[PDB]
Design an enzyme around this catalytic site. Structure first.
Site, PDB file in Angstrom:
ATOM      1  N   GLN A   1       0.818  -1.209   0.000  1.00  0.00           N
ATOM      2  CA  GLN A   1       0.000   0.000   0.000  1.00  0.00           C
ATOM      3  C   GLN A   1       0.853   1.261   0.000  1.00  0.00           C
ATOM      4  O   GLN A   1       0.462   2.271  -0.583  1.00  0.00           O
ATOM      5  CB  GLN A   1      -0.977  -0.011   1.171  1.00  0.00           C
ATOM      6  CG  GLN A   1      -2.103  -1.008   0.956  1.00  0.00           C
ATOM      7  CD  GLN A   1      -3.145  -1.044   2.084  1.00  0.00           C
ATOM      8  OE1 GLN A   1      -2.945  -0.493   3.180  1.00  0.00           O
ATOM      9  NE2 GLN A   1      -4.271  -1.716   1.811  1.00  0.00           N
TER      10      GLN A   1
ATOM     11  N   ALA B   1       0.459 -14.840   5.942  1.00  0.00           N
ATOM     12  CA  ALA B   1       1.310 -15.365   6.991  1.00  0.00           C
ATOM     13  C   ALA B   1       0.598 -15.427   8.332  1.00  0.00           C
ATOM     14  O   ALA B   1       1.197 -15.893   9.311  1.00  0.00           O
ATOM     15  CB  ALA B   1       2.580 -14.526   7.112  1.00  0.00           C
TER      16      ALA B   1
ATOM     17  N   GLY C   1       3.169 -10.586   9.322  1.00  0.00           N
ATOM     18  CA  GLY C   1       3.824 -11.874   9.121  1.00  0.00           C
ATOM     19  C   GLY C   1       4.608 -11.932   7.823  1.00  0.00           C
ATOM     20  O   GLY C   1       5.694 -12.533   7.760  1.00  0.00           O
TER      21      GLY C   1
ATOM     22  N   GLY D   1       5.565  -8.964   5.871  1.00  0.00           N
ATOM     23  CA  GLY D   1       6.591  -7.932   5.936  1.00  0.00           C
ATOM     24  C   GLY D   1       7.809  -8.341   6.739  1.00  0.00           C
ATOM     25  O   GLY D   1       8.920  -7.885   6.452  1.00  0.00           O
TER      26      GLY D   1
ATOM     27  N   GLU E   1      25.979   9.022  -1.796  1.00  0.00           N
ATOM     28  CA  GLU E   1      26.973   9.902  -1.203  1.00  0.00           C
ATOM     29  C   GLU E   1      26.590  10.302   0.219  1.00  0.00           C
ATOM     30  O   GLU E   1      27.468  10.435   1.089  1.00  0.00           O
ATOM     31  CB  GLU E   1      27.158  11.125  -2.104  1.00  0.00           C
ATOM     32  CG  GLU E   1      28.363  11.965  -1.791  1.00  0.00           C
ATOM     33  CD  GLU E   1      28.641  12.968  -2.880  1.00  0.00           C
ATOM     34  OE1 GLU E   1      28.520  12.601  -4.071  1.00  0.00           O
ATOM     35  OE2 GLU E   1      28.870  14.153  -2.541  1.00  0.00           O
TER      36      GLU E   1
ATOM     37  N   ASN F   1       4.918   4.377  12.941  1.00  0.00           N
ATOM     38  CA  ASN F   1       3.529   4.709  12.614  1.00  0.00           C
ATOM     39  C   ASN F   1       2.914   5.676  13.610  1.00  0.00           C
ATOM     40  O   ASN F   1       1.976   6.401  13.260  1.00  0.00           O
ATOM     41  CB  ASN F   1       2.662   3.443  12.519  1.00  0.00           C
ATOM     42  CG  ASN F   1       2.485   2.976  11.081  1.00  0.00           C
ATOM     43  OD1 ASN F   1       2.858   3.703  10.141  1.00  0.00           O
ATOM     44  ND2 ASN F   1       1.935   1.784  10.890  1.00  0.00           N
TER      45      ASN F   1
ATOM     46  N   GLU G   1      -1.033 -13.238   0.254  1.00  0.00           N
ATOM     47  CA  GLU G   1      -2.457 -13.346  -0.034  1.00  0.00           C
ATOM     48  C   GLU G   1      -2.792 -12.321  -1.106  1.00  0.00           C
ATOM     49  O   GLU G   1      -2.009 -11.388  -1.354  1.00  0.00           O
ATOM     50  CB  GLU G   1      -3.336 -13.144   1.213  1.00  0.00           C
ATOM     51  CG  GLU G   1      -3.147 -11.799   1.983  1.00  0.00           C
ATOM     52  CD  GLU G   1      -4.347 -10.878   1.836  1.00  0.00           C
ATOM     53  OE1 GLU G   1      -5.227 -11.178   1.000  1.00  0.00           O
ATOM     54  OE2 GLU G   1      -4.433  -9.860   2.565  1.00  0.00           O
TER      55      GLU G   1
HETATM   56  N1  LIG Z   1       2.021   3.264   7.291  1.00  0.00           N
HETATM   57  C1  LIG Z   1       1.337   2.161   7.003  1.00  0.00           C
HETATM   58  N2  LIG Z   1       1.448   1.051   7.816  1.00  0.00           N
HETATM   59  C2  LIG Z   1       0.754  -0.078   7.530  1.00  0.00           C
HETATM   60  C3  LIG Z   1      -0.074  -0.130   6.418  1.00  0.00           C
HETATM   61  N3  LIG Z   1      -0.636  -1.358   6.375  1.00  0.00           N
HETATM   62  C4  LIG Z   1      -0.183  -2.078   7.426  1.00  0.00           C
HETATM   63  N4  LIG Z   1       0.677  -1.299   8.152  1.00  0.00           N
HETATM   64  C5  LIG Z   1       1.397  -1.699   9.375  1.00  0.00           C
HETATM   65  O1  LIG Z   1       1.864  -3.026   9.240  1.00  0.00           O
HETATM   66  C6  LIG Z   1       1.727  -3.737  10.454  1.00  0.00           C
HETATM   67  C7  LIG Z   1       1.286  -5.167  10.163  1.00  0.00           C
HETATM   68  O2  LIG Z   1       1.963  -5.640   9.021  1.00  0.00           O
HETATM   69  P1  LIG Z   1       1.168  -5.875   7.640  1.00  0.00           P
HETATM   70  O3  LIG Z   1       1.984  -5.341   6.489  1.00  0.00           O
HETATM   71  O4  LIG Z   1      -0.187  -5.209   7.689  1.00  0.00           O
HETATM   72  O5  LIG Z   1       1.009  -7.474   7.520  1.00  0.00           O
HETATM   73  P2  LIG Z   1       1.419  -8.240   6.162  1.00  0.00           P
HETATM   74  O6  LIG Z   1       2.659  -7.610   5.573  1.00  0.00           O
HETATM   75  O7  LIG Z   1       0.284  -8.226   5.167  1.00  0.00           O
HETATM   76  O8  LIG Z   1       1.767  -9.744   6.618  1.00  0.00           O
HETATM   77  P3  LIG Z   1       0.600 -10.745   7.098  1.00  0.00           P
HETATM   78  O9  LIG Z   1       0.537 -10.710   8.607  1.00  0.00           O
HETATM   79  O10 LIG Z   1       0.918 -12.150   6.645  1.00  0.00           O
HETATM   80  O11 LIG Z   1      -0.724 -10.303   6.523  1.00  0.00           O
HETATM   81  C8  LIG Z   1       0.712  -2.989  11.300  1.00  0.00           C
HETATM   82  O12 LIG Z   1       1.254  -2.731  12.575  1.00  0.00           O
HETATM   83  C9  LIG Z   1       0.458  -1.686  10.570  1.00  0.00           C
HETATM   84  O13 LIG Z   1       0.754  -0.596  11.408  1.00  0.00           O
HETATM   85  C10 LIG Z   1      -0.191   0.982   5.595  1.00  0.00           C
HETATM   86  O14 LIG Z   1      -0.924   0.949   4.608  1.00  0.00           O
HETATM   87  N5  LIG Z   1       0.516   2.129   5.893  1.00  0.00           N
HETATM   88 MG   LIG Z   2      -1.750  -9.674   4.951  1.00  0.00          MG
HETATM   89 MG   LIG Z   3      32.356  14.914  -6.050  1.00  0.00          MG
END
Ligand SMILES: Nc1nc2c(ncn2[C@@H]2O[C@H](COP(=O)(O)OP(=O)(O)OP(=O)(O)O)[C@@H](O)[C@H]2O)c(=O)[nH]1
Ligand SMILES: [Mg+2]
Ligand SMILES: [Mg+2]
Ligand SMILES: Nc1nc2c(ncn2[C@@H]2O[C@H](COP(=O)(O)OP(=O)(O)O)[C@@H](O)[C@H]2O)c(=O)[nH]1
Ligand SMILES: COc1ccc(N(C)c2nc(Cl)nc3ccsc23)cc1
Ligand SMILES: [Ca+2]
EC number: 3.6.5.-
Lengths: 440, 427
Positions: free
Chosen positions: A15, A99, A144, A146, A254, A206, A71
């Site tokens: 996102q 995850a 999970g 990320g 740099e 965040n 997913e």
């Molecule tokens: N800034 C920002 N943070 C996000 C966003 N979506 C999720 N997060 C953060 O990501 C954390 C959870 O990780 P996610 O990325 O949502 O989970 P995932 O990567 O889909 O992995 P899964 O658990 O398997 O679904 C949460 O604590 C959120 O604060 C977003 O669109 N913008």
């Molecule tokens: Mg997810």
């Molecule tokens: Mg130079």
């Protein structure tokens, strides 16, 4: 040449990738169909924007990017969204089972089923590069995917692309918008696994972004979309030097030379200004001195911590828009006299400055006022370790009772992986203490 | 007696390009290589720096080198960029990332043979090669690391030729990265062993001159390089023009360097002028003489009164009384005799040339071998150890295969250089 490949992993990473690439298209005059009328180089060119976009013979400018999620939900909205024609379908990769907030599923159980395909797609992007410089990896600490899939990918990338540069944009968890109680576990596991495989990592807290939207944009309860429009502005400031030409342009690599004194001390604090509503920017122009000053106000930091009670090892200023070195140097001089900027005794105190003249863009219907000049400061401060301390403490409260650990063990992980990861974090917190102590 | 010129890296190619602009104008060569010249003094020794091509064109004996193509494109885009021989552009693609180790050991090594091939072609057409002159900075990666790699290889293949450099020392006041003191210290170690003469062009002094004397509030590298090109033009005068002296690089080396390692010169220039703004009163020979010896005109940020002049070479350009020039030069020595070592009799030699530089009716250029140059190396040595004691930023170098021990040797050699300069300041 000097291409950069972006990798967007999990919900947060995908996102945020949406926000960033939308903003890049607006900054470069690229339409949602990928056409760029001002590019007279049809099908190619070595222009600055070509580090982030390749070109087809049909004139389409395509992000050098891969989106991966375990997913399909989040990436499906990219496949059917405003910018669907921008991406080749093979750049958008989805599994079927996410995850489930579990690092072990992202790294092992579910992640291992798709990792080879992901590296095949990345390889197809690298093979179109004449001078690949490296990768920009976007993900959350807390998810999970990320956490676990990202660290699996970073390990595989070190194998498949030697020590080719790998940079991270990492979303540090906050209670206001977090989704899982085990986010501290996933954060420590992925930070430990990734530490050796990353050269430079930009943490975005965040809670800091949430506070800035509430305080400075008057958003009552910010959504992901609010956070991401601001985050993409910071990401754009950091990558602007790679994507635009400029006499005063200074390459991000740099700045890295200055930001990373030891391999493990590679987490710069980003501070961005001005963040102001349209209502408030009206009849109110912020000068170079004002936006520079705002970089030393802790409320404008991407990570909550107090640099006034830490020490600096580097300080970089990335300006964009109507800025000339004379104003910058004047602003820095007064700031030095009036602010608490203490450097460690082993590094020089000057500020490294980059100016790109292309002024900031805003997404239509956003909350940010369009301004004439903006700045992102990148500082290496020992204060950033506070963020590690808060996370390590949360990890310790739960791990002492082994709360939820059975969900990771049930996926094949061992307790020793947790303690090995927590010990590395303790040694990281100690590294940050040691670099701040005076020489003998 | 042909000189082969080499310019390496960002700074080397920018000050290199300015030098060729400036002396081409003095010799009556335009960007096309054609001579539309007033006097014939302009062509008599033109072969020292120029190859002649069919159709009576003059091509600089210059080789342009960089591990990154950007600033060499700007040179070729530049005013006189069309005068250089296109085969003599030798460049890679990856850059050096301000890393001496990359320029010297990993990136630069890949490209150095191509440069030596171009050096060889230019040398084989020389009737009697004097030697080489290199423009480079010591604070980056390419000019510093690959430049000193080139010097070492050029010495192996031409051990009986003279090696001369114009080396720009880094300064925090005009600084790109924190690792400049590392790059500079590793380079000085190379310069001490492998050049016969190097002009220490100190970005600190160039900045101080622009800010203080020339009242330029925010100096650019363009303002710094105006000073550099004027100095380079002056110190080359007796190589390029006929006179009572008819100098070459070996005679300069023999008469300026009493001990092999002490071959680092403080250049000086007068009158000090900023780019674009001209002042209409020429100096008097007495004024030229005082300004050229003033610490405020030195291109190396050292106080001459903190040391002694071993040798001095001075060149006066413009129509003037050589009698008055002689009296004024004798005056400064007789009035300040303590600052000239007593054990080198008559260690000041003056030359005069009729042709003045562009924009001035009269100028004076100063070349000093002073024990005060040790201040320059002390300053760099402090900045080096401040980081080195915590091994700060070393991973950029150990990642290219370098060892800490190599940093210790280079620092120790530069400290020895400081000691040796101190030894003769008291004799
Ligand atoms: N800034 C920002 N943070 C996000 C966003 N979506 C999720 N997060 C953060 O990501 C954390 C959870 O990780 P996610 O990325 O949502 O989970 P995932 O990567 O889909 O992995 P899964 O658990 O398997 O679904 C949460 O604590 C959120 O604060 C977003 O669109 N913008
Ligand atoms: Mg997810
Ligand atoms: Mg130079
Ligand atoms: N006087 C002057 N100094 C320069 C110029 N360009 C770079 N420098 C100096 O050179 C250092 C940077 O090294 P650089 O030559 O750009 O790296 P390279 O491309 O690997 O050779 C900086 O410390 C600058 O002070 C210039 O045009 N004029
Ligand atoms: C100390 O005694 C001397 C110092 C230097 C020289 N030589 C060879 C010079 N070579 C060049 Cl190229 N230019 C000049 C300008 C003035 S002297 C000189 C001769 C004697
Ligand atoms: Ca193009």
């Amino acid at each position: 040449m000097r291409e950069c490949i972006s990798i967007h992993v999990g919900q947060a990473g995908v996102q945020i990738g949406n926000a960033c690439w939308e903003l890049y298209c607006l900054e470069h005059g690229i339409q949602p169909d990928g056409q760029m009328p001002s590019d007279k180089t049809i099908g190619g060119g070595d222009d600055s924007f070509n580090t982030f976009f390749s070109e087809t013979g049909a004139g389409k400018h395509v992000p050098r990017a891969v989106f991966v999620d375990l997913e399909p939900t989040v990436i499906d909205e990219v496949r059917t969204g405003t910018y669907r024609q921008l991406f080749h379908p093979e750049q958008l990769i989805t599994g079927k089972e996410d995850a489930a907030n579990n690092y072990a599923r992202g790294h092992y159980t579910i992640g291992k089923e798709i990792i080879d395909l992901v590296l095949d797609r990345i390889r197809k992007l690298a093979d179109q590069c004449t001078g690949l410089q490296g990768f920009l990896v976007f993900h959350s600490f807390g998810g999970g995917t990320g956490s676990g899939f990202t660290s699996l990918l970073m390990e595989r990338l070190s194998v498949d692309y030697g020590k080719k540069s790998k940079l991270e944009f990492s979303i540090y968890p906050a209670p206001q918008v977090s989704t899982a109680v085990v986010e501290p576990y996933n954060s420590i596991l992925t930070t430990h696994t990734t530490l050796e495989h990353s050269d430079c990592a930009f943490m975005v807290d965040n809670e800091a972004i949430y506070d800035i939207c509430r305080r400075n944009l008057d958003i009552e309860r910010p959504t992901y979309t609010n956070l991401n429009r601001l985050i993409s502005q910071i990401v754009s400031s950091i990558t602007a030097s790679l994507r635009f030409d400029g006499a005063l342009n200074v390459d991000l690599t740099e700045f890295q030379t200055n930001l990373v004194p030891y391999p493990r001390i590679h987490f710069p604090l980003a501070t961005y200004a001005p963040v102001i509503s349209a209502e408030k920017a009206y009849h109110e122009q912020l000068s170079v001195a004002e936006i520079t000053n705002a970089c030393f106000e802790p409320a404008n930091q991407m990570v909550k911590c107090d640099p006034r009670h830490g020490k600096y090892m580097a300080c970089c200023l990335l300006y964009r828009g109507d800025v000339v070195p004379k104003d910058v140097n004047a602003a820095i001089a007064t700031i030095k006299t009036k602010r608490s900027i203490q450097f460690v005794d082993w590094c020089p105190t000057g500020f490294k400055v980059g100016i790109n003249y292309q002024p900031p863009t805003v997404v239509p219907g956003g909350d940010l006022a369009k301004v004439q000049r903006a700045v992102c400061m990148l500082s290496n401060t020992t204060a950033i370790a506070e963020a590690w301390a808060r996370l390590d403490h949360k990890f310790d409260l739960m791990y002492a009772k082994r709360a939820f650990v059975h969900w990771y063990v049930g996926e094949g992980m061992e307790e020793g992986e947790f303690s090995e990861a927590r010990e590395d974090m303790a040694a990281l917190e100690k590294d940050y203490e040691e670099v701040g102590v005076d020489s003998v | 007696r042909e000189i082969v010129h080499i310019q390496a890296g960002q700074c080397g190619n920018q000050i290199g390009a300015k030098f060729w602009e400036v002396i081409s104008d003095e010799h009556g060569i335009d960007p096309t290589g054609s001579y539309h010249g007033d006097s014939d003094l302009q062509l008599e020794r033109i072969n020292v720096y120029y190859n002649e091509a069919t159709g009576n064109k003059y091509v600089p004996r210059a080789i342009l080198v960089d591990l990154e193509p950007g600033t060499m494109d700007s040179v070729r885009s530049g005013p006189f960029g069309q005068i250089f021989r296109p085969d003599n552009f030798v460049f890679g693609q990856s850059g050096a990332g301000n890393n001496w180790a990359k320029g010297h050991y990993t990136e630069g090594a890949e490209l150095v043979d191509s440069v030596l091939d171009v050096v060889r072609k230019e040398s084989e057409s020389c009737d009697c090669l004097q030697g080489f002159q290199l423009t480079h900075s010591l604070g980056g990666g390419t000019g510093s690391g690959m430049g000193t790699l080139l010097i070492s290889k050029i010495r192996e293949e031409y051990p009986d030729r003279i090696m001369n450099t114009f080396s720009v020392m880094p300064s925090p006041k005009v600084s790109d990265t924190v690792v400049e003191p590392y790059n500079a210290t590793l380079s000085v170690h190379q310069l001490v062993e492998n050049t016969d003469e190097t002009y220490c062009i100190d970005n600190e002094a160039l900045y101080d001159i622009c800010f203080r004397t020339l009242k330029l509030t925010t100096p650019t590298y363009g303002d710094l390089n105006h000073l550099v090109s004027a100095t380079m033009s002056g110190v080359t005068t007796c190589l390029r023009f006929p006179g009572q002296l008819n100098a070459d690089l070996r005679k300069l080396a023999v008469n300026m360097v009493p001990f092999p390692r002490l071959h680092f010169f403080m250049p000086g220039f007068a009158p000090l002028t900023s780019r674009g703004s001209q002042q209409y009163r020429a100096l008097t020979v007495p004024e030229l003489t005082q300004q050229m010896f003033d610490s405020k005109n030195m291109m190396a940020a050292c106080d001459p009164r903190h040391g002694r002049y071993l040798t001095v070479a001075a060149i006066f350009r413009g129509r003037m009384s050589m009698k008055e020039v002689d009296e004024q030069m004798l005056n400064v020595q007789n009035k300040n005799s303590s600052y000239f070592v007593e054990w080198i009799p008559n260690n000041v030699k003056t030359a005069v040339c009729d042709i003045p530089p562009r924009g001035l009716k009269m100028s004076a250029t100063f070349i000093g071998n002073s024990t005060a140059i040790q201040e320059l190396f002390k300053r760099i040595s402090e900045q080096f150890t401040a980081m080195f004691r915590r091994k700060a930023f070393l991973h950029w170098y150990t990642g290219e295969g370098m060892d800490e021990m190599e940093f210790t040797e280079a620092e120790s050699n530069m400290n020895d250089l400081v000691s040796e300069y101190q030894q003769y300041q008291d004799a």
